Structures are given as structure tokens and as C-alpha cells.
Symmetry: C2
Subunit: 389 residues, 2 copies
């Protein structure tokens, strides 16, 4: 009966840990819990505006992954398609190890490898990684103004950190997927997303640049975590200071497009996407993805021994990986309230969403903090789970 | 004490197992036992001529291997030199396995890999081999009239059967070595052998073609083993019937040259080579190979598990492999009399030699039988061992 969600968010605001938080939980496609706390920015203490806009970072990945499943259904490519068929710059990959040894890859990177992060790619911010220094030198994440097509050419000449298919490592591979989608279709990934997903779902505020009236709605982003600097040996201190994004995340670049980050969205827009994932259909009943392929996308695909699923050694307890993100496969190993089959993902600025099929439930938490030492997304899911019967 | 050598050889001749046999044992560079038995050919029972000529087959390999060591000493290349530096056709090798899987090699083939048969090559006659079928289709051994340079081009396009350096399999790699010697020097391997080995050791009857007066001295070859046909599931029966060599082993082709077989020689010529291996010097005292590099070439280099060294599953008990051939590393595992450090090799037509530094002893048996079911070379070594210290 107590509003645990409001208690969590208000404590976070009152302890100066987050500037502003929005949340909404839907059941059967209708809101049952929602609220907001704090402000758009602590500098002017402006209230969170209507249709506030958030940098959702890695919550871009489930959207681009869902687009890939749609193109698979349409026969554009298949899970086993070697990506080198569409961009030969990814022919003849190499593999580097922690002992300075480099050898040719023994398997081709496939579409499935990209979707499961089993391709062998890494990330500029990967701590202790045998290749992340070369990502940083190449400015893959730092240089947001560089066209997706050109960024991929630079990336394609670097070695992988394991042979495709043989391990899991969370990676820049969703960006490779967005690029390969462009090669396979002859279209741009932002145009495909607009036509195939955003327009049918009425997500009119979602895209890689701001809407014309969007500058006043953009939430300020705080925190010290860098996605392209020298990887931190200890978590950056949790202080509400505005974050410097450099040129990594432009607001008004009409060619900026990526697969692993870069979308702007709103709470309402992302909830439309999350609700669709319960069925593969728009609210009006138009099918975006057949039930069979949605099931293929959601079924647990990567299993972990233990240490479990980890990103920069942070755990995702009880979660396996499917083609769109995490999926709860063992409630007895979960670190916070959930149900078997709950799935979703999150972003580096602490945005978080989940879909819980056993409860016909979706939830989303929107905020802007890079490098939180506090797992607000999981605290809010837990609170919402605890508020059902 | 009695002459076991003569007894062994006479019994083989009298049991119609071999047509004719010559042998010599030297100690301190001088003959101590010698003899002959049988005839040049059983069809006419012509007597074994003076300086009878034999096809020594794989006893070519220690000679070509020794030539490689001479060139390493002279700075032409080194053990660690990748052979692709000298012939780019051996860039980008592939590896096939018994489950039909093919992948790029994870290491470059080196000179050392060729000398140790750890490069991953195989042989046309290798039974159960994942690639030998493709060797036979290519007629690598069958087509003796094909120039060494051209045969290597065909071989280079085929996959290896393991990653270079990771296993041992007796192979066509000595032929690759002869070719790479030609690439590295710009000279022909048969000219280099003539100038650097045969002439200084007065091996006047040794070469890839018969000498001018050689036809009348060539011993007849018997037996039914095939080095290029479909590998036999059971050893070919031991029948003293002349062998059909096809065009694999021409007598008067001035361009025929190989690394792994093909030399003609005589008992006296091969004993000059074997005696030199006790010191690296000619009888006069010219150094063909310094003591340090001779030690480098003779030291045990490939060690074997409990299965031991095997060729088509036939054992070489207690032997390890050095850069020139076999070397006895455990008398307690040996299947016939020997001493620690005894080394040498043998040929498919049952020629056999050894060098025993603990006794300052060399020995060579010459005969012509392809596919003997009777290990005459080992029987003669054992006899000589029993007759000396």
C-alpha cells in the first residue's frame, strides 16, 4: 500500500544523488503507477517539463535490435548471415589476447554474434581490455561527429578480443549492427527506425537529434563517468555536477546515428516501445514483429557460468542474454525483485526499463546521471514489483 | 661375437624376402664389418655390381636437412624464419580437421617447423588423414616429372592438418624445405647439394639422376607398397615382385629434384655422409658444419607422449626427433639394441642407416623393397650393436 516508488525517488532527490527522476509502470498497456521527483536542472531548479527528453544511451540497443529482428522477418538477412557479406571491410578479422599474441579469427562474425555481443568486439571504456586502448586512440566513442560509416571503417581494422561465437563481452557490436543494417538495406538506420518503429508506435520525440521545440525539454545530465577516457580504476565519485559530453553526443547533427547509444527519447515514448514488446503489436493491433520471431528474440540465448553476466565486472545476477538485452532466468539468483522472464535493458545515464510478461507489466525510469554509484533503475523495479499483489 | 650381420642378411635372401643386400659398419671412420648377400635382380640373378646404386627415398631427408643447417650457419635464413618470407604462396595457410572444419592457421610456418615435421603438412600415402585425399588428387608424389617449384605451388593451396608448431606428423615438409632453400638462395637444391655436400665428401654416385654408367648398376626394386595410391587398410603382402614406380622416380630427368625422396646413392657414398655426421668434418678436415650447429641439429627437439613417435601408426620406440631425423632418447623404451644418442633415418625401400656417437660407429644397410613386413634395417643395427662394445 505505501508508494514505495515515490519514496525511492524522493530519497534520491533529497540526498542530492539525482537531479530529476520520472517513472511510469503500465499493466495491460495502461498506467498503474507514475510520478516524478526533483528538477530538470539543479542550476536553475526548473521543474521537469512536459515530455522531458533524455539521453537513453544503451537503451538504444533494444530498439536497434528489434529493428534487426524485423529485417530478419522480412528476409533482408538472417541470424547466421556473415556480416562480411554486407561490408567486406570485416573480412579477415584478427584476434588479440592479453599476452600480446595476435592471430586470424577462426570464425566469421554473424548477425547473431552482433546481437548477442559474442562477436569479439569491445568498448572504448572497457577496463583492463586488451584492445580498448586502440578504440580510445581511434576516438570511436569520443568522435560523435564522425559518420557511422566512417567510424566502422576505423573499427574494422582493429583486432577482436576473442574468436567470434566463443565468449560474451558487452561491446560496440550494436553499432556494427546498425551499420550492417545500412549496408544490407541501402537505407539509413535513423530512417528505418522512424518508418518501421517510431511512426507506428507514435514515438514522435524519439530520434538521434532534438525536435525543433526540444531544447527547452532536454534534461540536464550529471556525473563523472566517461565512456571514452582512460578507464577508471575506481568508480568516479557520485557528485551532481553537469557532465561534459564533448562532441560524443550532438543535439542537432542531422547525420548523427549509432546502434549502441545516441537516441533521445521521453518516458512516454519509451513506454510505448516497452508495451509493444509484450505482444509485438501496436496498441491498434498492427503487427510489427510476428509472435514466432518475438519469441525467437526473447528466448534466453547466452548463459553464464559462475560469476554470471558482468559488464566491467559489475554483475547482472540471475540474468541471461537474449537478442534484445537481459532476461531473468533464475529468480533464486536475482539480486532484486523480479519474475522469471522479465527482460529489458538500461543506459549509462541511469535510464532503465523492464518488461514482465508474467504480470503483463512494463516499467521505465528516466533520469540523467553518468556513473551512478546507486542502482536507481533496479531500486525502482523492486519497488514496483513490491507494489503489486 | 659371431657375424650376426651376415646371418641376418643371408637368412633374408634365402627366405626370398629380399633380392640383394649390402651393408657396412665403420668405427672411427674405417670399415669394421661389411658384406653383401643375394643378387641385383632375381629375374636374371645378375650379381650385385660394384658400387651398386639404390633409391634411398627418405634417406634423402637427412641430407637436405643437413644442407639447411649449413645455410643457417652461413646466414641464408634461420630456424625462426617464416617460409612465407621466401615464397608468398605460403602466406595465409588454412587448417582442416577430421570434422570438416577449416580455419586460418594461427601461426606462420618456419624453417624449424619444416625440419621437425611440425608445420602441419601431411603425405599422399597418409592413412586416415583429413587432407591426404587432396594430395593424391593433386598427384604430389605420383607426378615425378613436375618441377619442384610447380608442385609446391599446388601444395601451397591445400590446408594443413594442424596449426604450425602444435603437433608432429611425418610429412612432405622436407620437400617444402628444399623448395624454400631454392627461394632463399636463388640456386637449385641439386646444385647446392653437389657443391656443398657431395663433392667435398667425394659422393660421386649420389644425385637425383643416374650417373653416366649407372643404368647397369641400379638395383632392382621390389614390393607392393604405394606412396601415392589409396592408403592400404592392411600392410601390402611381402612379395618379391618388381615394383612399378610409374613416373614418380625418373632415372634420367635433369630437372627432377625433391626434398623428401628421390636421391640415388651407393653404400659407399652414404657411409661417407654418415661418418661426417660424427664430427661435421670431411675426412681431410674441412668443416661442413661447426660443432655448435651440429649439436644444435642433433639435440632432441620433438618429444612424444605415451603413444610415442609413430608414422602411419608404426612405432619408433624410444626415439625423439631432431632437425635431421630420429634420435634415441630412452634405451629403456627402445625396441631393439641401440645406445643413447644413436641417430639417423631410413627409406621406404628399406634402406637404413645409423650413427652411434657412444661407439664412434656408423652403419648402413642398402636394399630395394617397398613395403617390407620385415624391419631389416633395425635387425641389422641390432646385429651390429651386439657385435661391438
Amino acid at each position: 500500500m505505501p508508494d514505495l516508488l515515490t519514496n525511492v525517488a524522493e530519497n534520491y532527490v533529497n540526498q542530492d544523488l539525482f537531479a530529476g527522476i520520472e517513472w511510469r509502470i503500465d499493466q495491460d498497456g495502461k498506467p498503474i503507477f507514475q510520478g516524478c521527483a526533483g528538477v530538470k536542472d539543479i542550476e536553475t531548479r526548473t521543474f521537469i517539463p512536459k515530455n522531458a527528453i533524455y539521453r537513453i544511451y544503451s537503451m538504444t540497443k533494444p530498439i536497434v535490435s528489434f529493428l534487426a529482428m524485423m529485417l530478419i522477418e522480412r528476409g533482408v538477412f538472417r541470424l547466421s548471415s556473415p556480416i562480411q557479406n554486407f561490408d567486406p571491410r570485416f573480412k579477415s578479422m584478427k584476434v588479440i589476447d592479453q599476452h600480446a599474441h595476435i592471430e586470424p579469427a577462426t570464425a566469421l562474425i554473424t548477425i547473431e554474434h552482433l546481437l548477442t555481443h559474442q562477436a569479439g568486439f569491445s568498448y572504448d571504456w572497457s577496463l583492463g581490455c586488451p584492445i580498448s586502448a586502440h578504440y580510445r586512440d581511434a576516438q570511436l566513442i569520443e568522435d560523435g561527429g564522425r559518420d557511422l560509416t566512417d567510424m566502422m571503417g576505423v573499427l574494422a581494422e582493429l583486432p577482436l578480443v576473442f574468436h567470434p561465437g566463443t565468449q560474451w563481452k558487452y561491446s560496440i557490436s550494436t553499432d556494427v549492427l546498425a551499420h550492417i543494417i545500412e549496408c544490407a538495406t541501402g537505407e539509413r538506420v535513423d530512417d528505418l527506425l522512424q518508418r518501421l518503429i517510431f511512426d507506428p508506435l507514435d514515438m514522435q520525440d524519439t530520434g538521434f537529434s532534438l525536435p525543433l521545440d526540444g531544447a527547452s525539454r532536454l534534461m540536464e545530465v550529471y556525473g563523472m563517468r566517461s565512456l571514452h577516457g582512460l578507464p577508471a580504476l575506481k568508480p568516479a565519485p557520485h557528485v551532481l555536477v553537469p557532465a561534459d559530453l564533448g562532441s560524443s553526443h550532438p543535439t542537432d547533427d542531422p547525420d548523427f546515428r549509432r546502434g549502441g547509444h545516441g537516441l533521445y527519447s521521453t518516458l512516454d515514448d519509451y513506454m510505448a516501445f516497452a508495451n509493444m514488446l509484450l505482444s509485438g503489436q501496436t496498441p491498434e493491433g498492427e503487427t510489427l514483429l510476428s509472435p514466432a520471431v518475438l519469441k525467437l528474440a526473447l528466448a534466453p540465448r547466452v548463459h553464464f557460468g559462475a560469476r554470471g553476466m558482468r559488464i566491467n565486472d559489475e554483475p547482472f545476477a540471475g540474468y541471461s542474454w537474449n537478442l534484445l538485452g537481459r532476461v531473468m532466468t533464475d529468480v533464486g539468483a536475482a539480486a532484486y525483485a523480479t519474475h522469471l522472464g522479465e527482460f529489458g535493458w538500461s543506459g549509462a545515464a541511469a535510464t532503465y526499463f523492464w518488461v514482465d510478461p508474467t504480470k503483463n507489466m512494463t516499467g521505465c525510469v528516466m533520469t540523467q546521471f553518468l556513473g551512478s554509484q546507486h542502482p536507481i533503475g533496479s531500486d525502482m523495479q523492486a519497488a514496483a514489483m513490491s507494489m503489486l499483489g
